[PDB]
Design a protein around this ligand. Structure first.
Ligand SMILES: OC[C@H]1O[C@@H](O[C@H]2[C@H](O)[C@@H](O)[C@H](O[C@H]3[C@H](O)[C@@H](O)[C@H](O[C@H]4[C@H](O)[C@@H](O)[C@H](O)O[C@@H]4CO)O[C@@H]3CO)O[C@@H]2CO)[C@H](O)[C@@H](O)[C@@H]1O
Length: 358
């Protein structure tokens, strides 16, 4: 399944033939950093990497980028061209992105572009900064939309990575109301290609209640994002364990029984109530503590195993494929070749199937 551009129907995503599909993928970061390209191409051929992602059973790649790669002549700076990647030589970050998107389509994978950082220096709480205005943000989203218009390999956009304090959901103040910003951006994107799915993340605090950046969608029920083209919206949340931040609910004595309460509250309810599909965009852990291992086992079950629920479940993209992620580690090990079959083992009940070639 997976043919053509997708659309929502209740809490599910459906391909063009109306067959339900499930995004069960991985994050492959690099384009958002100051290397201006996905990491690991210093040890592997990109195609050999894409083929291995497919082999492990992952069907979608969330590809983080920063507005820097849209500046004229921006080139990658961490690729090795000996006996590999010979065709990426002399190409700009964008042209290298076109190659990755193209091969991914052919082998049956899909891509979701994620505006991870305003610039390669770091993330931002708001969707704009003094150096990267809101208009650049929108022009850039429209440019990428235009660039891949007609190639269903790119199924949709993750508007802004991890909006957080001081951002608000529904407060009505245009300078911090992420809810209004997402509609503003989403509608600009849909004006270029109205078949793209629009993935909108949450904030951090809502009603004095704090949660992971990008994961607080508590205001969504009361203050929905409303787009010009219906059945394109998918809410998104992020959730992590102690390897990232020793949140307090991990110290709760009833842990992990308290978890589904937290999850239901902040994002699950949109799914449970069949309002719209929900995508856990980032989640990972080094699995060093027994707590993260229990957290992962628990969470994997909450997201609904494919054997039981099929496509009527939560969409997900784990973090990350890269082994060079500070406090989460990744599926590959430090050699960019050996799989961490153990961590990979936990995600098995929620993996789905590879899509149709594009
Ligand atoms: O992008 C390349 C870069 O990625 C890093 O991995 C990051 C992800 O990129 C990022 O999206 C994700 O965001 C984290 C953030 O890093 C944490 O510091 C933050 O912790 C917050 C917490 O959310 C709050 O609730 C709490 O109150 O405060 C703390 C901060 O003090 O939580 C968000 C998640 O919502 O985190 C990933 C892992 O760090 C890699 O680390 C880096 O090596 C890569 O180069």
């Amino acid at each position: 399944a997976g043919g053509g551009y997708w659309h929502t129907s209740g809490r599910e995503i459906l391909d063009a033939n109306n067959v339900p599909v499930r995004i069960a993928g991985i994050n492959w970061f690099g384009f958002e950093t100051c290397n201006y390209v996905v990491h690991g191409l210093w040890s592997r051929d990109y195609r050999s990497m894409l083929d291995q992602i497919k082999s492990l059973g992952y069907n979608t790649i969330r590809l983080p980028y920063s507005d820097d790669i849209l500046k004229p002549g921006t080139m990658p700076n961490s690729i090795n061209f000996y006996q590999m990647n010979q065709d990426l030589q002399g190409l700009t970050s964008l042209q290298v992105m076109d190659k990755i998107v193209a091969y991914a389509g052919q082998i049956g994978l899909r891509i979701i572009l994620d505006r991870h950082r305003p610039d390669c220096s770091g993330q931002s709480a708001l969707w704009y900064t003094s150096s990267v205005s809101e208009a650049t943000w929108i022009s850039d989203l429209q440019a990428l939309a235009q660039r891949y218009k007609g190639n269903p390999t790119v199924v949709g956009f993750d508007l802004h990575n991890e909006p957080h304090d001081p951002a608000c959901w529904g407060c009505g103040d245009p300078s911090i109301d992420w809810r209004l910003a997402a509609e503003r951006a989403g509608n600009a994107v849909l004006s270029v290609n109205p078949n793209l799915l629009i993935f909108v993340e949450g904030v951090q605090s809502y009603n004095g209640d704090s949660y992971w950046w990008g994961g607080n969608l508590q205001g969504a029920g009361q203050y929905p994002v409303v787009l010009n083209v219906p059945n394109r919206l998918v809410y998104s949340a992020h959730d992590y364990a102690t390897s990232v931040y020793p949140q307090t609910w991990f110290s709760d004595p009833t842990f992990p029984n308290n978890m589904p309460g937290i999850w239901n509250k902040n994002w699950g309810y949109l799914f449970n109530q069949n309002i719209a599909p929900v995508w856990l965009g980032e989640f990972g852990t080094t699995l060093q503590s027994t707590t993260d291992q229990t957290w992962l086992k628990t969470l994997v079950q909450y997201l609904r195993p494919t054997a039981q629920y099929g496509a009527d479940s939560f969409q997900w993209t784990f973090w990350s494929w890269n082994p060079d992620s500070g406090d989460t580690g990744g599926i590959l090990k430090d050699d960019w070749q050996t799989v961490d079959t153990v961590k990979d083992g936990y995600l098995a009940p929620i993996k789905s199937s590879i899509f149709d070639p594009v």
